[PDB]
UniProtKB/Swiss-Prot annotation:
Ca(2+) 1 binds at residues 243, 365, 368-369. Belongs to the transient receptor (TC 1.A.4) family. LTrpC subfamily. TRPM4 sub-subfamily. Changing residue 248 to A/C: Abolishes ability to restore sensitivity to Ca(2+) after desensitization. This is Transient receptor potential cation channel subfamily M member 4. The lineage of its organism: Eukaryota, Metazoa, Chordata, Craniata, Vertebrata.
Length: 993
């Protein structure tokens, strides 16, 4: 497609010969037959360019580097259009040109670090072009090293301009037919003076042609022209975009640099000067330090500075001084970047210069500076300069900045922008949302959900949760992209603060659980905790302000973006901290007691329960008669107690049947009653699971450990009854029921989960299993070791596999509990007799299962092992176990308490929906079974929210650290004025003459 390049461009040639050596600098065999001070255009011929192509540097590289040869007398528009269109280079959001000679093989270490850290990172963040000398020499070489080093730790496109004559290895460049690929001998062994190679760090090269064999300054005119054109160009979308800022960064140099900066200053191009660069750079910085220095006593100083700051040759010459005066004539444009002892940052300095350079007030030329302020994180500068108030603004003007801030995750900026009266409601558009959700990072988790899923966010949430106002949308977006600060601010401006906070906590925890990155989850978890901590803090403030209002309505109400009440959101989120609050705990307790006063003594309840008429007296504090009756019997607490009493009777009946009434004969009256009673238990448990999305509710019901205990209990009961009825399995049926009774009794621990002083204990017990298993495994190993060894020594003659196991495992086990059968191990306590022809001596233990007769070869060893076994198992292990419990108990006591408090809600809800009657009678119940205030409330919530925020923010401001920070700043301001006053005193003293 590059076929048309040669026509537009041309390669200049010396043509005419100007005086062995030729003034044009191309001494060859002979100039053309056609061939005084030589001139660039007077004695040159323009011919079609014969060096365009893309370099492919030998060895390491991207195999893509555009090389172009062009004449000096060429419009910058053509090259820029070619650069923007053909090579695919994007419109530069910023362009910063590096200039200077930087005499010496290497530059100062600090200066190199400044270049690589400051310049390169800033360009990469904003994707700024960096035009420099397209050669592997001096400053250009340093830049390439900086680009190379930055790239390695990763792209920053950094074009280069170099005169054609100076380029080395130009033979492979020359190709009139064009060279889409091209091999360059960049590793040029001979470093032959002026000729230099092309540094391969740069992406594109503008080989300025002026009909010379190598010279310097021939690219100045073209370079500046291109600088001006880019300074007068709009980025993308034709002219609908905004101007492209341009900066000239100078580092040391010579008088030639001084002319370049003067020409650039004439073209209204911002310039920045690095302090400490050296000659041709410090002199200007010094002049700025003096600024409007008095003519008397300083007029000759300029000569002194040229003498010392600049090289003596031509330094005494007043030509340099004249340029400095012209340079200072436009001192507004240029500035000085003080190293500030390795400051290492210059985004503020760059922005400060640009705003100074603008000098406008229409706010139409400050969009580019604003965008750069947004792209970089510097926001304090933006408000200080862009929003000092000297310039008005409009919503459309801020729309672009807002979008970039959001996409680039610039929280401080979006806060600032919104602070300036931006009509957010009229701003948001469905298209913009699509842009936002399209701004997910590469193959992010959100992308996966979108890919599986036109934002279509509703489907995403419906999938995430389980499928069971602009602020809300922004908050939701921020949460999905995990822009913590963005979300935090949005929630701050939200409406349903407490509900939103919990919703956000739920979403992040679900997102983190599903996040496979294994690292983003940590950040999501952290943010979730932050929101929960924020929501809990807010609610506590609301609860103190107005108990009935907040508690009752603000939670029990139906929530937003869901159908499960606000508490259920907390339950899903497992917001342990939120439930731990006194307000919620008090609220739950109130619901636990139903209509009865939560302060009702427990004994009072029991007496009423056994004396139903006693409810109507003043003992219990809360048609009227019927209403009170149902209120008493409908409260969750009474349902719980009524259920407990029934359960105890069930066990009592079970034991009575099991111990006595159970016989091989067909079931008796009580046995049948138990069956019906048990069957009713099954029916009730079925209702719980079926009314906990069939697969969903079934699964969640199974999740409860207690419900698992119920299932296993009932199933065993079914097997027991089934086996019992069958003619030939009476014994097996009885056996399994006995075990079944054990399961039912153990289920009785659910009762202790209610009391506040016991519920935490049960939780802690659940966490001790780790220690118990350690003890068992350690003990199991020891028993096997000791048991087998002891059995081996004795050599009992029974040697029957059941008995062998008894002695190997059972007997040593009991020894742990003080059951030590000495007469079965110690030969001293046993009779001596003859048992078998096997050689040796034998003894006859008296025990029944101790073996008919054991060897006594080395019996002292058996006793010795017994001594060791007791020492280890009976003292060390048991005591070690006690130590582990003590440590574990102390550690997990705090967390266990929170877990119980959170679980307390689940219990209450479970008994809230249970039918009134008790299990034995519950059958009948089963048979019988088969707006302005909201606005008022929301406003009340929000007012408390901001009060809480203002108090928190004010607290931060009053903190010591902030006072110290503010104090230091005021001192600096005071020091500033003192200096100005000192200058005022000096001038007045001079005027005193
Ligand atoms: N256009 C270029 N010409 C020469 N060196 C370049 C160029 N671009 C980058 N470099 C790097 O600059 C350094 C040039 O010095 P030089 O190659 O002599 O030293 P080196 O890295 O120790 O390796 P060696 O001397 O073995 O090639 C190398 O790191 C080379 O990779
Ligand atoms: Ca501008
Ligand atoms: Ca149950």
């Amino acid at each position: 497609e590059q076929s048309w390049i040669p026509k537009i461009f041309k390669k200049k040639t010396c043509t005419t010969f100007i005086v062995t050596l030729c003034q044009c600098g191309r001494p060859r065999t002979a100039h053309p037959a056609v061939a005084t001070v030589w001139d660039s255009d007077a004695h040159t011929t323009e011919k079609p360019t014969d060096a365009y192509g893309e370099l492919d540097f030998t060895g390491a590289g991207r195999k893509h580097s555009n090389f172009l040869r062009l004449s000096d007398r060429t419009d910058p528009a053509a090259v820029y259009s070619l650069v923007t269109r053909t090579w695919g280079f994007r419109a530069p959001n910023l362009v910063v040109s590096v200039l200077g000679g930087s005499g010496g093989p290497v530059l100062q270490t600090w200066l190199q670090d400044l270049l690589r850290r400051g310049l390169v990172r800033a360009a990469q963040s904003t994707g700024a072009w960096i035009v420099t000398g397209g050669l592997h020499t001096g400053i250009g070489r340093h830049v390439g090293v900086a680009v190379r080093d930055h790239q390695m730790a990763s792209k920053v496109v950094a074009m280069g301009v170099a005169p054609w004559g100076v380029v080395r290895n130009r033979d492979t460049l020359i190709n009139p037919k064009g060279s889409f690929p091209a091999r360059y001998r960049w590793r040029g062994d001979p470093e032959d003076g002026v000729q230099f190679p092309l540094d391969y760090n740069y992406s594109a090269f503008f080989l300025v042609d002026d009909g010379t064999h190598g010279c310097l300054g021939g690219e100045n005119r073209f370079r500046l022209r291109l600088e001006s054109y880019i300074s007068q160009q709009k980025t993308g979308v034709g002219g609908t975009g905004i101007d492209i800022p341009v900066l000239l960064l100078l580092i040391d140099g010579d008088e030639k640099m001084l002319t370049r900066i003067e020409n650039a200053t004439q073209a209204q191009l911002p310039c920045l000067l690095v302090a400490g660069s050296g000659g041709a750079a410090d002199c200007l910085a010094e002049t700025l330090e003096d600024t409007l220095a008095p003519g008397s006593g300083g007029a000759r100083q300029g000569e002194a500075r040229d003498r010392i700051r600049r090289f003596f040759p031509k330094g005494d010459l007043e030509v340099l001084q004249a340029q400095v005066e012209r340079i200072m004539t436009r001192k507004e444009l240029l500035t000085v970047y003080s190293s500030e002892d390795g400051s290492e940052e210059f985004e503020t300095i760059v922005l400060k210069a640009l705003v100074k350079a603008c000098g406008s007030s229409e706010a139409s030329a400050y969009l580019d500076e604003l965008r750069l302020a947004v792209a970089w994180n510097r926001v304090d500068i933006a408000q200080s300069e862009l929003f000092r108030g000297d310039i008005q603004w409009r919503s459309f003007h801020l729309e672009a900045s807002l979008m970039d801030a959001l996409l680039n995750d610039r929280p401080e900026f979006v806060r600032l922008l919104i602070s300036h009266g931006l009509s957010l409601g009229h701003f948001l558009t469905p298209m913009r949302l699509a842009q936002l959700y399209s701004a997910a990072p590469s193959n992010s988790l959100i992308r996966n959900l979108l890919d599986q899923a036109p934002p279509d966010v509703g489907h995403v949430l419906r999938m995430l949760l389980g499928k069971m106002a602009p602020w809300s949308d922004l908050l939701l977006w921020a949460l999905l992209l995990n822009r913590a600060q963005m979300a935090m601010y949005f929630w701050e401006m939200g409406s349903n603060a407490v509900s939103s906070a919990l919703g956000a906590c739920l979403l992040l925890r679900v997102m983190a659980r599903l996040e496979p990155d294994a690292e983003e989850a940590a950040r999501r978890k952290d943010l979730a905790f932050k929101f929960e901590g924020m929501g809990v803090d807010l609610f506590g403030e609301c609860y103190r302000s107005s108990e009935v209002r907040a508690a009752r309505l603000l939670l029990r109400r139906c929530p937003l973006w869901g159908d499960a009440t606000c508490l259920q959101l907390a339950m899903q989120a497992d917001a342990r901290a939120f439930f731990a609050q006194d307000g919620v705990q008090s609220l739950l307790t109130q619901k636990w007691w139903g209509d009865m006063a939560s302060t009702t003594p427990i004994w009072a309840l029991v007496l009423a329960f056994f004396c139903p008429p006693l409810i109507y007296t003043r003992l219990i504090t809360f048609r009227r008669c019927l209403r009170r009756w149902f209120h008493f019997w409908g409260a969750p607490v009474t349902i719980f107690m009524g259920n407990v009493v029934s359960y105890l009777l069930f066990l009592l009946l079970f034991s009575r049947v099991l111990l006595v009434d159970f016989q091989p004969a067909p079931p008796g009256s009580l046995e049948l009653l138990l069956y019906f009673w048990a069957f009713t238990l099954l029916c009730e448990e079925l209702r719980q699971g079926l009314s906990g999305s069939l697969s969903q509710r079934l699964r969640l019901y199974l999740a409860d450990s207690w419900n698992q205990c119920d299932l296993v209990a009932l199933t065993c009961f079914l097997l027991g009854v089934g086996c019992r009825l069958t003619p030939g399995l009476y014994h097996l049926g009885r056996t399994v029921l006995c075990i079944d009774f054990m399961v039912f009794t153990v289920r009785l621990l659910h009762i202790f989960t209610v009391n506040k002083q016991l519920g935490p204990k049960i939780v802690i017990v659940s966490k001790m299993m780790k220690d118990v298993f350690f003890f068992l495994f350690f003990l199991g190993v020891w028993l096997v070791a000791y048991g087998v060894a002891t059995e081996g020594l004795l050599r009992p003659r029974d040697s029957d596999f059941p008995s062998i196991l008894r002695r190997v495992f059972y007997r040593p086990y009991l020894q742990i509990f003080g059951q030590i059968p000495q007469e079965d191990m110690d030969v001293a306590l046993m009779e001596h007799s003859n048992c078998s022809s096997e050689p040796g001596f034998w003894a006859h233990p008296p025990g029944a299962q101790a073996g008919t007769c054991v060897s006594q070869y080395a019996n002292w060893l058996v006793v010795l092992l017994l001594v060791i076994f007791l020492l280890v198992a009976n003292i060390l292990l048991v005591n070690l176990l006690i130590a582990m419990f003590s440590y574990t108990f102390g550690k997990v006591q705090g967390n266990s308490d929170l877990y119980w408090k959170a679980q307390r809600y689940r219990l209450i809800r479970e008994f809230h929906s249970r039918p009134a009657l008790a299990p034995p009678f519950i059958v009948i119940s089963h048979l019988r079974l088969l707006k302005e205030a909201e606005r008022k409330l929301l406003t009340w919530e929000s007012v408390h929210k901001e009060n809480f925020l203002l108090a928190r923010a004010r607290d931060k401001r009053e903190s010591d650290s902030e006072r110290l920070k503010r104090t230091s700043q005021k001192v600096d301001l005071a020091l500033k004025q003192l200096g100005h006053i000192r200058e005022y005193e000096q001038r007045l003293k001079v005027l005193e003459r």
